[PDB]
Paper text:
INO80 is a >1-megadalton chromatin remodeler that is conserved from yeast to human and emerges as a central multisubunit enzyme complex that determines chromatin structure around NDRs/NFRs. The Ino80 polypeptide itself carries the core ATPase motor activity and acts as a scaffold for the three modules. The INO80 remodeler specifically places nucleosomes at the boundary of gene regulatory elements, which is proposed to be the result of an ATP-dependent nucleosome sliding activity that is regulated by extranucleosomal DNA features.
To determine the complete modular architecture of INO80 A-modules and to gain insight into their interactions with DNA, we used cryo-EM to obtain high-resolution structures of A-modules from C. thermophilum and S. cerevisiae. The A-modules from all three species revealed similar overall architectures and conformations. As observed in a previously reported partial crystal structure of S. cerevisiae Ino80HSA-Arp4-actin-Arp8ΔN (Arp8 N-terminus deletion), the cryo-EM structures showed a sequential arrangement of Arp4, actin, and Arp8 along approximately 20 helical turns of the Ino80HSA domain. However, the cryo-EM analysis enabled us to define two functionally important elements of the INO80 A-module that were missing in the previous crystallographic analysis, the N-terminal extension of Arp8 (i.e., amino acids preceding the actin fold) and the Ies4 subunit. We could visualize most of the CtArp8 N-terminal extension (residues 14 to 98) with only residues 1 to 13 missing. It forms an extended yet defined chain that folds along INO80HSA toward the actin fold part of Arp8, with additional contacts to Ies4, Arp4, and actin. The resolution of the maps allowed us to unambiguously define and model the central part of the Ies4 subunit and define its interaction within the A-module. CtIes4173–192 forms a β-hairpin that binds across actin (subdomain I) and Arp4, stabilizing and fixing their mutual arrangement. Comparing both structures sheds light onto two tryptophan residues (2W), which emerge as key anchor points to actin and are highly conserved among Ies4 homologs.
Residue numbers in the entry:
A (entry chain W): 13 to 116, 139 to 466
B (entry chain G): 722 to 808
C (entry chain X): 160 to 197
D (entry chain U): 6 to 64, 101 to 511, 618 to 747
E (entry chain V): 4 to 40, 51 to 375
The structure:
Amino acid sequence: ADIYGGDEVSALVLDPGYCNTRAGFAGEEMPKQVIPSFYGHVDGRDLFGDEVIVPRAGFEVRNYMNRDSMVEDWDAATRVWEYLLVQRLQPPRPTPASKNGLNVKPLTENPLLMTEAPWNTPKAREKAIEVVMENWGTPAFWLSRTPVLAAFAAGKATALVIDVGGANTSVTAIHDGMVLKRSIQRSPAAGVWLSGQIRSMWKSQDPPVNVVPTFMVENKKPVEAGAPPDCRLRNFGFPIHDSFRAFEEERVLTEFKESVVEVWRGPGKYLNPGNEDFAKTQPGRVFEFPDGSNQMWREQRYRVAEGMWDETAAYPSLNPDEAAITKAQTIPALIKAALDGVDVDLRPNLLGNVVVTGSTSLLNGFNDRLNHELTNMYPGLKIKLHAAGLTSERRFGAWIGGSILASLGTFHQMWISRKEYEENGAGIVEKR
Amino acid sequence: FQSKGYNQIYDQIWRDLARKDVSKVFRLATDSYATKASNLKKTAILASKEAKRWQLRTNKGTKDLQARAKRVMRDMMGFWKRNEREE
Amino acid sequence: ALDRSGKPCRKWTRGTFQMKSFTGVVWEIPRWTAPPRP
Amino acid sequence: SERVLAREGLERTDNGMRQTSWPEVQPINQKNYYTDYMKRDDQILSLRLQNEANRERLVMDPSKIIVIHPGSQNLRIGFASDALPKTIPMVLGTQYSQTESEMHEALPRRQFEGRTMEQQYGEEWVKKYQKMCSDLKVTMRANKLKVLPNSKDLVVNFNRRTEPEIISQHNDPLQVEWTNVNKAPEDGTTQKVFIGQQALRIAEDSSPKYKLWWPIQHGWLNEDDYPTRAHLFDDLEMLLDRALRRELGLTKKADWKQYSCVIVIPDLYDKRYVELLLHLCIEFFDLSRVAFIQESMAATFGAGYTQACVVDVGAQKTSISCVEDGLVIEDSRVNLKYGGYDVTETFIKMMLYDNFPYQDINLRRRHDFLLAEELKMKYCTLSQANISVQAFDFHLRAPNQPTRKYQFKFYDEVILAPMGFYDPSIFDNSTKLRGRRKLIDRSYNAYDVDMPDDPTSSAQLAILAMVQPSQRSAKEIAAERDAVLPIAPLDVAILTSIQHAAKGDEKKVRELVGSIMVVGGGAKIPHFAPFLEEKLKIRRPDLADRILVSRSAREMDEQVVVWKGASVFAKLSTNDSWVTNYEYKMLGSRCIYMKLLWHY
Amino acid sequence: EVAALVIDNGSGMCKAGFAGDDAPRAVFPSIVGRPRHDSYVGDEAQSKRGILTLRYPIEHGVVTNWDDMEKIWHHTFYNELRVAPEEHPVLLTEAPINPKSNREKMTQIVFETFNAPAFYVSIQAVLSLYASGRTTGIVLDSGDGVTHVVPIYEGFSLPHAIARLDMAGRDLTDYLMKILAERGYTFSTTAEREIVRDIKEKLCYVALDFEQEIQTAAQSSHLEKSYELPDGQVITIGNERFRAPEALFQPSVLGLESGGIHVTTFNSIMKCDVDVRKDLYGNIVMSGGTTMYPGLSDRMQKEITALAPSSMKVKIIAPPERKYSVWIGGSILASLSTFQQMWISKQEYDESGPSIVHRKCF
Ligand SMILES: Nc1ncnc2c1ncn2[C@@H]1O[C@H](COP(=O)(O)OP(=O)(O)OP(O)(O)=S)[C@@H](O)[C@H]1O
Ligand SMILES: Nc1ncnc2c1ncn2[C@@H]1O[C@H](COP(=O)(O)OP(=O)(O)OP(O)(O)=S)[C@@H](O)[C@H]1O
Ligand SMILES: Nc1ncnc2c1ncn2[C@@H]1O[C@H](COP(=O)(O)OP(=O)(O)OP(O)(O)=S)[C@@H](O)[C@H]1O
Ligand SMILES: [Mg+2]
Ligand SMILES: [Mg+2]
Ligand SMILES: [Mg+2]
């Protein structure tokens, strides 16, 4: 032939999650578009992007994902994915000449690779291809599991994937690029739960600590540790919605997690007889709220993280409905329960290839604790840990795996075609 | 679809894809990213030096500026030698 | 070096490329194409 | 197996693709590199446009060049073709809730209803006035002049035992004209604002109420009196707009694009003030070109001197600089925050202490300010032989109140207020530094936003070290110096400025000391140049054979030598220092660096 | 050897000139005209507007008609710069996060329509950073059509952290016309838009405390500056002088639901890696024409200091040349000897086609 260029297939890679949704082209080291899964609603209008959430009279904040990490609202999901894949990632249309002030289907070129949670039920998978083929004129589709992509993001065929997200923590064994369905184990003890631990720990302090989000503060002056804040608040004609207020407080909690909170990495559990007493003698870490309020954090820094390793250590939920985590839902329990679901021959292979993923896994000391716990519970095996990702940036794991996968030449025989769908209607069940 | 033949092909494609292709393309991508980041960093070091260099004082610059200043001052002495002689 | 003495490049155009699934179904992806160079 | 899979139609395939589309970036070689950026003058917009202009010339009208010399009491303005500048007070009157007199404590400063005069004037000041009196007596006794022991007693007793005479409205020899603030303007503009002499002659109790704004004080932007940077910039713009309309008669603004401008700046300039002036001229006035010359350079160009030590004594600033080979000697620059205005306030305070009749005088009140300037111009003198108990009178004329005549006597207040230039602790220095960076920050490098870019000199640091002996960053060192007000005796300032100019070369000290030139209105006190030469000669007896101080040059007024020099700089053909309108629209303040005739 | 051309197209103004120069040779409006019932570009099209339909081919920084865009490049080479592209390498610029299809489409036009011997595409914000004399920072780039915030670490932008306030220079002209109509002047015509643009670029400024300038504007003879129309009649604008640019910091006043430029800058820093953020606050760089309002940097230093922690050392960099920082960064790049081994050669285009631009231009 000799008629063709370097052009082969430009695939779109889509990765929806309870906190974040990420979109981009395959063959690229990071997603172009990353937006909250929380979206604004005002006056029938839906508003997407961290930049469009701003105090207004009608403003209410919603999510199109449930805490099962699955789509709850396919209407809203279609509007969010239209925004990312069509408005942000394709060419625009021009404005009319009458409106410029001087004079007085959309995805037909790009097949779509979509990421699902490993416990995603078949009715949901059927609705994903139904929604994708009907709305967008996509040529071809693929639907893959978060753990497989995280293992390919670490450059691994066979791996044990620990995936500590927002809504869920998961453990799963991948072998020869496929999920061992008996190995899947899941837990609420993840990032959203860690925010509830922090909120609880703040309301338990001797003088209570009150979070007030940045949007409510006009101007602030620096003050000494433990002093009341020199600060002046905004006021609004309208009452602020509880959902908006909550979404804006979660930015402050995420800044507390990335900078104060530390996993106890030391010898044995944090509640062993010497450990908490020693923790109080260490230097702390300082933190400022948007109000200017300022304090040094010593041992509470450790105690908020410990609950996902030891169910005894956890603070009570401030929500009286959200039941306490059980021994079976801790990370060491999920690991033991996951490898007990696998052939004894594979265990040394899997534990030599531990792959860690999910933004909650970025806490100070997390890998050090995980390594120690694996080493003590499987003695006499070589344990080694791998980051998902090409770079020191580890917030995207599954998305980079999709990017590598959809760029392999051998993969292009896998896509479900438009024609292949039109002949069958539920091709997914048998093609994955 | 529901047969040992189909299952064998699907599994054999994924085994080769996972073991051979994913391992090669991850090494190529990680090296490629390190080259891209290195290329860009060193370029930005050159371009940022150029943007500032017009400010650096030099032997040539100072002598040319002493020469500009001395010509203007000799033209002011000329000006008076005409007007103070013609008035 | 740079150019010979101007002289045009070969034209590229959005064509279509037939490609095949492992289950034998054939589908078309848009792709850049050029006429064969002598 | 295989043929049963093929019979079912199942077959694994390359699709003719490469192993991967993932991009393989080659490493750039960065060794042995060179650059082509701004290597040739044709690549620099400023210099290209100058070369184009020089060609267009070879292959300008003085009446089209405005010459501006702003100041803290007086603005001097004219066309370069003019023999002399138009001079007006650099002040602006606008409508406001309050007058300048209502907002602040009276001047000179007195602790009213204090226990005693020693508190009312302040004990340190009273001790210093008594020291200066005793030193003057010893000095003029050594010179064998007359000193009657009761000289101060005659003055104090007469002033204490004397009262004013009210004069009938028509029997007054000079009926005052106050500015009619109600009158519609006729200068192609509508806002009822007044500039210069018209603003000073607004009655304190006009029907709409006016405040006077002085946008420059102590020789820098008067940030203290303004609430915002926007208000200060809007007023220096408004003052110069009205000066072009009202002093130069340039009534049609659309025609201003055909004029160029020469601006005189201080030798220790603030880069923010230079960049404000260039922005006024090119963005608000739309002039064709602007050029800058430093006060000391312009002074020598007025004279026709190749090499000189220039002392410029003004209302609110005194500056010393040496100049040589077309450049101000960058290390020699000294800049002291006193002038002839201090002499007015010190004279009024010394006389008030000596029971001067009009105890209610307040130099924040416009008629009292004009009276104090007039008194100071008549009587203050550094010729010691003129001194005896002297008797005189003045007319207090005040709005909507009948003219009062005061007889008064004085003895030595007339010499001791000037002699403050050799002990400047007698001047009220207490508030001069208030507001110094309140609205407008220090100049920092365009790129390296931590490093201060305002000029410095060895001599001005040597002066600050006399006031206050002075790892810290460049901002900490700068902020530490900004806290010290530069005050030194004028004889010490001159000899330190010259010592830094010569860098220890005795032969350049001898040349510069024989070349001292005095200018500015504060120097216009009688016998000032002879007095300064005597003071230098007793401080350096080794140089007494060669110290030579001169007032003005080529028979000009001390107040216009600098403007005459600026107007010659406009005219002479070798001056390529012009920043054109278009350069500035492209590159802003950056073109100053390209075009000025010193390292900006 | 000959210099590359550097071309910086924009929703408002095209800039063009030779690599190694410190400023463009040519600047003209990105306007094309066709007969209502031959074609014209820039101020010739503005002049003849009575018989033309006038269009902007670039919208919010993205090319939206390639027919009109090709006329603008044709004008730039043959009428503005007076050079044949066949002799010179060409550096073009592109808006942050613009579509991959458009990078291919411009790559085709330089090789197939102009026969450029060699070519490159570069991200505007990164050029502006090189001009500002640093390798790491965050660029607020605000022009006629769009305002972007772009984090950059050691010469590499961070596209997931790029935020885009969809409001800039034109929106403030339309707002200034609306509030001058509320003061009783008449403004609703294209000639009148060019008048009001000239008012905005002279009389407008950014208040350091907006509620206190509203409080004090009630009486000030200093505030009420005035302006003479081409007709010779005179208009006088007061609180409108600082109300117009306040729409950058409070887009609510302009009737759109978004964070202002100070909040969007804070948000972009807070999408980056924690170890990077100190270096972003210490290097906030301002670029583009809409950043030229007096007092803007001083308000940015105050506004970002209110959001940021008390431990952070916020610095705003706004150099004098900042309306042309994108062009200047282009000129510097395209004048490095290293550029010869960074461009797409027309041999690579012959073998690889339009998609070569993704392999070679980052
Ligand atoms: N650097 C950080 N350190 C610790 N926690 C972080 C950090 N950055 C973000 N988080 C938390 O990470 C959680 C989100 O993690 P993600 O990996 O984005 O979750 P996600 O992928 O949307 O969640 P799922 O589980 O896939 S539905 C939130 O609860 C954040 O508060
Ligand atoms: N005949 C005179 N006798 C005594 N003092 C005089 C005389 N004429 C003017 N002055 C004083 O000169 C001072 C004004 O000097 P100028 O040089 O005009 O000041 P200025 O330039 O506004 O001050 P700078 O240089 O900007 S600080 C005033 O304080 C006057 O009182
Ligand atoms: N001095 C100034 N003060 C205020 N606004 C100005 C000034 N100069 C130009 N502008 C405005 O800046 C805008 C043009 O800015 P540019 O950055 O050149 O536009 P551009 O490059 O076309 O814009 P984009 O962002 O690239 S679409 C117009 O709205 C002008 O009115
Ligand atoms: Mg996740
Ligand atoms: Mg003066
Ligand atoms: Mg632009």
